[PDB]
Amino acid sequence: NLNMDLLYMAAAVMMGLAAIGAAIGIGILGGKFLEGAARQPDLIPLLRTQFFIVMGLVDAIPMIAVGLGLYVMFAVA
Template sequence: MENIALYAEIAKFTVIAAGLLIGLGALGTAIGFAILGGKFIEGSARQPELTPMLQTKMFIVAGLLDAVPIIGVAIALLLIFANPFLSAIAG
């Protein structure tokens, strides 16, 4: 019976950790995109002739910025579906 309670406790904290990973990753990315877009528009307004170069660099940084929530989702899925902490109580 205590193994079931321990399993439920680990599953509970795993779901909380997965939610925090996904939520905070999305929040950080949203803030990053807001800053990136604002600086891009500001730079384009100051020097319109540099807009194509700035746009290329903006998309490169946006692609790198997207990696953060994707990695967070991958780790969250690992924790949910292949939880390494449950092996401690299985054996």
């Protein structure tokens, strides 16, 4: 029945939006990391520490989104 074709598209939309948000929200942060590095490389290790510490936060909601997307697209099908 037409349950499964719409279920497919719902996961596709949620996960496409997740992908856009995560890609851009990390790109910005990494760009600032690189322009902070280039002015004084000797701080690369500390700023990379800070970079991961922060980026693990940006990747909070998009991970939830991908989890639900896979659940719907496979578990609920």
